[PDB]
């Protein structure tokens, strides 16, 4: 039932180059925090986000996804002409039409046999993209796929901070709104391939998904997310052999320190198997999972044989959990 | 005689149900042309570029408060009835529309929530201009062929109200330039509507139509040709035509190799339509018999990725499709991409 000939040939991430610290945000918000009499530092002390990155002026999602794609192709040591599928999984999109994938593909110079489209599914889309690509690889439709994701938050910061510091701003409009200030910029890309082409590479086994779409309608969400993850774990038991103590890394969506700590505590996971980047990068949406895996790889933390869980709880609510064997 | 492989076409995937929704408000080209007339005069335009050149006489609109997810959901409930199954049987729901309620969450999650899908139901959106329904069908077919689910919904609601209202305002400005006017005119060929399809493993619906899949080719060097956001679409229709037909020629070659296609052996061609002249050029350049090409563009316009399934649904409801018919699904989508797939009724 699991995928046996789907591999990860290459992976890369791009860290965005401008730093915006939560201290800096708080200096700009101080006058508003003071009217309103707010006195907790919600970003730094509660969410646990001390900084995030921002792109240069006028970097689009496509541009960031393109930069990641180029580095991933170098990591796989393959030319663009081998790519038969390019899936873009970002939340951020250049337009509604065409697909952001078509623009990234056009930038890269893919062949006329390359199928492209975008998948959107909040922070779980990269895992959905991987699974989609796996299915095509498995069937022999393509040899190599790129899954790419560039996330842009510059506009959301500009507009959100302009809003919040207006003289009319009510405190309701302030609170959920602060939430946008946990987002970050960044990009990732992965080349997947048929295993017989890349026999020493990590293998993607597949995964499971469960859903709680009765909540599409933000600490109920934390609680309801965990309940849904619990159900998703049960399915991961039955389809993948999962037990917590047998996994070497958990690569998880990163939303907040509290969200991460509650997850780790519910499941009795060793926190040392859970790398986090939100403290310096914030929440990079669906790119967070592959950015974390890529950091794990580049830091030499992944050994041959390691069992890696990729997962997230995404808006919807949805929860996906998949396995890679390094 | 000679053992041959499947060419990677889908095995044991069927279409269990299909439905469409027509949007309720007619907006005639005559009404649009009255609103545009002072601009036509200023720009020296003396031909009816909507009705006589593009060949669009009317389109349908929703109420302003209808979102893509609402339209899709309505189509989905109809498709479920067509398939005679309850929502609890659905293991995959994919939304394929260009229109979207939000960047996050997905439109599929909203539709799923409205329908009451089970907690086993996987959901996501796919975006790929006017070919996305077919992509969604392919993605679902891969799961169905492998036996991971029994039934899937593919859903698509399109809302063009905003683009109409804002385009018409921009185009009636005393200062709009000729170039802007021509860039935005194709927005006035869009229409509202919705479609949904329930796909199933063929063992469950033995008399249902079969979906085989098919072939795709691309020309993503042309990704700047058509660009759209929630209130504006700018299109180079001249190069979409020329470069579209070139890409399609290449994609017909692949279809001959993979699907066995010869145009004269297909019974129906369900085509995505940009305009009457684009459609006439495509049918002429490929030698397709015009009697095998159903058009709704005249009265409904270009419903984006919902066009193909809506036309398929209307053919089914007309009784034009009989058992054994070979049905080609074809489109050229912004990108550019071209997909060609086969249904056997």
């Amino acid at each position: 039932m699991l995928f046996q000939n789907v591999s990860i040939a290459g992976l890369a991430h791009i860290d965005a180059p401008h730093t915006l610290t939560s201290k800096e945000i708080n200096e700009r918000l101080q006058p508003t925090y003071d009217r309103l009499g707010i006195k907790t530092d919600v970003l730094g002390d509660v969410a646990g986000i001390h900084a995030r990155r921002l792109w240069d002026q006028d970097v689009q999602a496509s541009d960031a996804a393109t930069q990641a794609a180029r580095k991933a192709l170098i990591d796989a040591n393959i030319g663009i002409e081998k790519i038969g599928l390019l899936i873009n999984t970002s939340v951020s999109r250049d337009y509604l039409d065409p697909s952001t994938a078509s623009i990234v593909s056009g930038n890269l110079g893919v062949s006329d046999h390359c199928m492209t489209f975008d998948v959107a599914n909040a922070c779980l889309a990269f895992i959905n993209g991987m699974d989609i690509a796996a299915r095509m690889l498995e069937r022999g439709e393509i040899d190599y796929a790129l899954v790419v994701d560039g996330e842009t938050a510059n506009l959301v910061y500009e507009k959100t901070l302009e809003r919040m510091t207006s003289p009319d701003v009510t405190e309701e409009e302030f609170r959920n709104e602060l939430a946008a200030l946990t987002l970050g910029c960044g990009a990732a890309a992965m080349v997947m391939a048929r295993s017989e082409l890349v026999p020493d590479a990590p293998r993607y086994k597949g995964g499971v998904t469960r859903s709680a779409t009765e909540w599409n309608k933000t600490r109920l969400l934390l609680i309801e997310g965990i309940k849904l993850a619990q159900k998703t774990f049960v399915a991961a038991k039955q389809v993948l052999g999962w037990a917590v103590e047998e996994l070497d890394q958990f690569v998880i969506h990163q939303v907040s320190r509290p969200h991460t700590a509650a997850f780790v505590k519910s499941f009795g996971i060793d926190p040392a198997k859970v790398m986090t980047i939100f403290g310096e990068h914030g929440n990079i949406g669906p790119a967070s999972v592959p950015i974390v895996l890529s950091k794990l790889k580049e830091l030499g933390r992944l050994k041959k044989g390691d069992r890696i869980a990729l997962l997230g709880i995404g808006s919807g609510l949805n929860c996906s959990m998949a396995e890679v064997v390094w």
Side-chain angles (χ1 to χ4, degrees), chain A:
Chain A
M1 220 49 202
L2 298 177
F3 304 120
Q4 303 164 351
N5 53 352
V6 177
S7 299
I8 298 176
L11 173 59
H13 72 279
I14 306 297
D15 279 347
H18 300 313
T19 292
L20 170 56
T21 75
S22 291
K23 193 175 191 285
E24 288 151 8
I25 287 168
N26 287 338
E27 286 166 341
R28 176 165 181 194
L29 295 186
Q30 207 47 247
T32 302
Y33 266 130
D34 285 346
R35 162 172 82 77
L36 316 182
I38 295 139
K39 323 270 225 161
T40 331
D41 166 11
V42 172
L43 292 186
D45 294 322
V46 184
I49 179 166
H50 299 298
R52 80 287 293 136
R53 309 290 192 77
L54 302 179
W55 298 109
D56 295 297
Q57 180 92 110
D58 295 306
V59 171
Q60 308 298 323
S62 61
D63 291 320
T66 298
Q67 291 175 38
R70 287 186 191 297
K71 280 185 84 214
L73 293 164
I74 290 159
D75 185 56
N77 198 45
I78 51 149
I80 195 60
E81 72 289 343
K82 300 300 231 267
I83 298 302
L85 172 66
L86 186 161
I87 299 180
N88 183 96
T89 60
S90 60
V91 171
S92 302
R93 275 175 75 276
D94 292 25
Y95 298 103
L96 301 180
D97 183 2
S99 67
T100 297
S102 70
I103 298 162
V104 174
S105 292
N107 292 343
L108 294 166
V110 304
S111 84
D112 61 5
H113 291 44
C114 188
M115 177 192 291
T116 66
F117 52 91
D118 294 342
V119 171
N121 192 19
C123 73
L124 286 188
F126 204 96
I127 295 170
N128 303 134
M130 287 175 66
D131 202 68
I132 289 155
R135 299 163 190 286
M136 294 181 65
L137 289 158
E138 193 198 51
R139 278 180 91 263
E141 289 182 47
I142 48 167
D143 289 346
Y144 295 91
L146 264 167
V147 189
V148 306
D149 192 309
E151 296 302 337
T152 56
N154 283 47
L155 193 65
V156 69
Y157 277 84
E158 198 209 295
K159 296 288 151 174
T160 301
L161 292 166
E162 274 174 13
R163 216 125 60 209
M164 280 167 156
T165 57
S166 316
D168 57 315
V169 179
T170 71
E171 172 142 321
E172 325 205 319
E173 208 204 287
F174 210 77
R175 262 207 221 60
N176 259 254
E177 198 162 73
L178 271 168
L181 311 176
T182 62
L183 302 179
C185 296
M190 183 180 286
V191 176
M192 293 177 80
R194 290 176 55 88
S195 302
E196 70 275 13
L197 311 178
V198 293
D200 296 327
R203 283 168 184 252
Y204 177 70
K205 305 304 304 202
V208 296
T209 290
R210 295 287 179 268
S211 68
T213 58
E214 66 271 23
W215 301 112
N216 80 82
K217 281 88 239 269
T218 115
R219 169 179 324 148
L220 82 174
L221 282 194
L222 162 58
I223 291 278
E224 286 311 318
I226 296 300
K227 286 175 179 189
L228 174 60
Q230 271 193 342
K231 189 178 299 192
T232 305
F233 261 123
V234 162
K237 240 206 165 51
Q238 293 155 351
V239 356
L240 308 167
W242 281 11
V244 153
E245 37 298 312
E246 304 271 48
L247 301 159
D248 304 294
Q249 296 290 336
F250 298 77
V251 183
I252 73 169
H253 185 234
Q254 273 157 57
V255 183
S256 77
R257 172 166 60 211
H259 280 205
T260 296
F263 189 87
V264 163
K265 177 247 275 271
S266 304
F267 297 124
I269 290 156
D270 180 352
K273 297 183 180 170
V274 182
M275 171 170 267
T276 59
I277 65 173
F278 54 82
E280 304 83 34
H281 293 274
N283 172 357
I284 319 182
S288 306
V289 160
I291 291 169
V292 175
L293 180 68
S294 185
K295 292 178 175 292
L296 289 166
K297 176 186 140 81
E298 284 172 25
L299 290 164
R301 306 276 173 83
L302 295 185
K303 333 136 233 277
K304 183 141 279 316
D306 281 355
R307 301 174 75 204
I308 302 159
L310 314 175
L311 64 101
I313 299 161
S315 319
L317 290 170
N318 289 291
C319 173
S320 290
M321 286 177 175
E323 180 170 344
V324 172
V325 186
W326 205 254

